Amino acid sequence: LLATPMINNAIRSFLTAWDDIRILSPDVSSKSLSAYLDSAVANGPELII
Amino acid sequence: VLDPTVLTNAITTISESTTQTISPISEILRLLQPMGNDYAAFWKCIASW
């Protein structure tokens, strides 16, 4: 972490600003990926009567 | 008696400009000089042979 402070300070601005990519990064809804899939099931027609 | 003020005293007297951001003396001085066990790895290697 050696840089003139003005330069080192500049890195923090860039580094954190891309930390808000990680607050909404890969979605933890891997179980609810099926709940994304479950939203399309109920508009299935009843073929079998 | 491996005394590390012989390696350090040769690198510290090379002259470099302080106006450069990345300073190639302070990198290698960070690389080796933090010291763990006064450099006893060398004895282990020799012991193992």
Side-chain angles (χ1 to χ4, degrees), chain B:
Chain B
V1 184
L2 29 122
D3 187 282
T5 71
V6 191
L7 224 208
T8 277
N9 218 335
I11 306 167
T12 188
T13 60
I14 310 297
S15 89
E16 58 175 18
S17 41
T18 52
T19 58
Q20 298 295 316
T21 300
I22 281 298
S23 169
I25 282 180
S26 162
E27 312 295 331
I28 124 154
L29 240 296
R30 180 235 290 157
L31 234 305
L32 45 88
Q33 202 50 238
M35 57 196 64
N37 289 2
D38 292 351
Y39 340 86
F42 174 68
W43 297 121
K44 274 204 312 173
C45 293
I46 280 198
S48 147
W49 285 337

Side-chain angles (χ1 to χ4, degrees), chain A residues 1-37 39-49:
Chain A
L1 306 292
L2 325 164
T4 157
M6 179 283 207
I7 282 176
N8 189 131
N9 155 31
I11 261 284
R12 282 175 194 160
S13 142
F14 164 88
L15 208 301
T16 72
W18 277 89
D19 211 303
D20 317 353
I21 62 100
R22 305 211 332 268
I23 79 178
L24 61 170
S25 204
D27 203 14
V28 84
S29 89
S30 59
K31 185 193 176 188
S32 175
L33 168 137
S34 58
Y36 160 74
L37 197 71
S39 68
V41 192
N43 276 18
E46 34 172 0
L47 271 311
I48 294 103
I49 317 159

